[PDB]
Design a protein around this ligand. Structure first.
Ligand SMILES: [Ca+2]
Ligand SMILES: [Ca+2]
Ligand SMILES: [Ca+2]
Ligand SMILES: [Ca+2]
Ligand SMILES: [Ca+2]
Lengths: 218, 189, 218, 63, 189, 189
């Protein structure tokens, strides 16, 4: 019939987030092997001309915004597959490779390109078998034209997710501290009219770690 | 290996009219004992870096304290609670709570009970060796550069503006670090 | 993840010492049968001359400071043993006994001494066998010269531990309330030169009761 | 005290007094120092209980 | 390790009119052989330090001798028998007794029978190393200081005043000590 | 445990007087690194304290060096070769040799070859703790008192009084000590 009442002087609580998730999102995430579009193989008129792609989660369109909720990341696999889409009457070849030091210069000829990491080359209409590698975890085979970054060098490193692009004024040595590597694509055949004989697809896998507010993530 | 060592990190200050936001760089440099010991070494690695808050105010006091870590020196410091609540090892409590954390200062137990603590996940640095630095980062220094020698930043915030400034509690550090490499304290910068 | 907080209006406690010990020391203590030095048998020139020893824990050197931590005490056994240490050519005898009333006068001759409680006497070089009684709980035997206070009269009484000596101005009747008894030793043979033919050892046992701060104990 | 509730029509106006607030969807109220038990509901899927002060949007209308 | 060595400690003196009270500092310094050997070493530790009294007087002689140890240099020396009887290893006997202790001087047996001995409990020093000193403590030296290099003090007393001064017996020492640390005898103070 | 650490003790100074010998107190206080580290602790114990002499002069230099330890602060400092030879861990050698000892500065091996070293026998302190002191012993301080917090004194002297003061070599210390008990460096005296 009667219940006692003994209010405290004040009321409060102590919150410590961290099951293994903060604010409803895991503090650790593995994408697993995924496939996404990197870019097209653009051929132009200059010989020096080459395309450079910085290894970064920013290169993943959908995965990008997800990564924004994490502070650190690590490349577990980063392989580019070339898929030809042109007549077999198309002359010229394609050369791809990785640069592991942001300070190193970008190759301007075949002799030099051939020395890049995981270098690979092929006639522009070759590599048709590569299309089977997409969306699967299969391993390169057939005339598949691929180039994979040896991610074993990053197995102990944790990069901080950076969303802005490196400036000009930035010392290469500094840029090198947060850019795992650069992927380079070159044409050995300068053309009269610009064209796009094939495409570059990315088979990757990355780890995301550390909770952080997306808006404060820079 | 230094073993667990307790250090006074500083008081929790609340300035009137504005929500407090103290930032501590994760380094032994300023610590009374650890700082001194560390000066005779060139490299260090954090094995355990946990801050425990101990109140010193009345149960009538209003407001809470918020704590967390920022792992990228380039990331901006949280300006509100929702944002702060997404940081690493976020913790928040009434400004007068945390009294049960007292024992953690002379023990090595894991934070438990009504203890108000925030610990930096050190697994991230298990393979790295940071160079001990005793100078403050330049205003002009590029964030990406600072990030190379600063394991992380610890942030403390007030949830709401107070009318009168005060110091509701103390910030304590339980740390364990590895020191390596010989150098003369006087040439160690 | 979140724990409730409900502080009291104030915090405190209630202390009640008394397991059977206060401030780390028992509230009751039994010494058991112990042996300690009482004093020497001093022979002088006057006939009236006799030595008086007040029955009190103060007579125990080491046990004394321990007793200071208690308020009450009771004699369970208090026996003096005479141990001779002299040539068998030594003349004279020793007389010992107890006075149960502080008002009663001290005997000045043999006829009178003989009537004291637990009276006993012997030639000054006698009582050699008594040395075996020391440190043991054995009972008097052999030519052992001993005198034991009949402690049965105190089996219901509890004396308050007093550390100061009785004044002159103090009425004997008052002194008698806190002094269990007086032990008297007399020589029947006045000597030319003072000497000490033997020693007096004490075999005792007392009970201490009641906690009290040593410094406030008077 | 505190008063909470939901407005299901963006056109409806925002309550300006207790009498009116009390009619909002999933309305709930309590003295400002009440609802301490609610802290146990956090990070768990438990259901409201104790003096927990909560207000839940009936999501069945959006199924 | 020196092994057991017998040393003459001195005679038992009884001065007229007053109760004797000789005090010996526990040190090898003054010992005929041990003192010499010890001079070539810097540190020492007592393993066995026992004094045995041997009479040299007539059975007609009066009085007894009392012996014991004081473990704190600050403690005062006993002035009467009851007080003396509370000291460490207290022993007392007729001034003419103790003749059976004779054999203890060339043996290593434990004191037994009618032997008059007093042994310092050396377990107390099993982990300490004292610095060998050859000088007498200053009058002005603080007792607490002296205590740091004096293991203990041996005290000998007479139970009652004699009319004529005499020397009823001899004080002998059976000791075993450990010596460590090299030094030149001449620089050893 | 600090592990082995190399410290510059000072140079070997030769002068004109005969009773000219350099004396170093065994303590971390003055050491460049060890001193800094020790400041954060209250107690210490020497596990290894060895001095290595290294030349820096011409093979035409005459004379020799003598080193050793004094375990009792009250013992006097040797003034001639005969008595220096009796110090603890005494060692000597010509002034221009001792090159085989250079490797001992980064190794932890034992003195061999023509290496000139003197190692304090630390088994003496295996059971005690010294309170770290940073002040210089008073002039008026009683030797016995100073002895209580000074493990030992290291002495270096020349046998060849020189005409012109010079410095034939350097004195290097490689030590290993245990530190215990926390204390604020600024509080540590
Ligand atoms: Ca970032
Ligand atoms: Ca540095
Ligand atoms: Ca009393
Ligand atoms: Ca000495
Ligand atoms: Ca100190």
């Amino acid at each position: 019939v009667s219940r006692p009442l003994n209010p405290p002087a004040a009321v409060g609580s102590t919150l410590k987030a961290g099951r293994g998730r903060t604010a409803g999102v895991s503090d650790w995430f593995d994408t697993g092997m995924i496939t996404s579009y990197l870019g097209g193989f653009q051929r132009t008129a200059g010989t020096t001309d080459s395309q450079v792609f910085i290894v970064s989660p920013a290169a993943l369109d959908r995965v990008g915004t997800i990564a924004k909720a994490y502070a650190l990341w690590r490349p577990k696999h980063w392989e580019i597959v070339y898929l030809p889409r042109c007549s077999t009457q198309t002359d010229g070849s394609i050369e791809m490779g990785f640069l592991l030091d942001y300070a190193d210069s970008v190759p301007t000829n075949t002799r030099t390109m051939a020395s890049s990491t995981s270098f690979t080359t092929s006639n522009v209409w070759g590599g048709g078998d590569g299309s089977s590698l997409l969306h699967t975890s299969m391993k390169s085979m057939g005339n598949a034209v691929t180039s994979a970054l040896p991610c074993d060098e990053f197995s102990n490193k944790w990069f901080k997710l950076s969303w802005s692009t490196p400036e000009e004024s930035e010392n290469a040595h500094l840029t090198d501290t947060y850019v795992p590597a650069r992927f380079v694509v070159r044409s050995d055949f300068p053309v009269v009219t610009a064209d796009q004989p094939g495409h570059l697809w990315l088979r990757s896998r990355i780890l995301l770690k550390g909770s952080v507010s997306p808006s404060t993530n820079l």
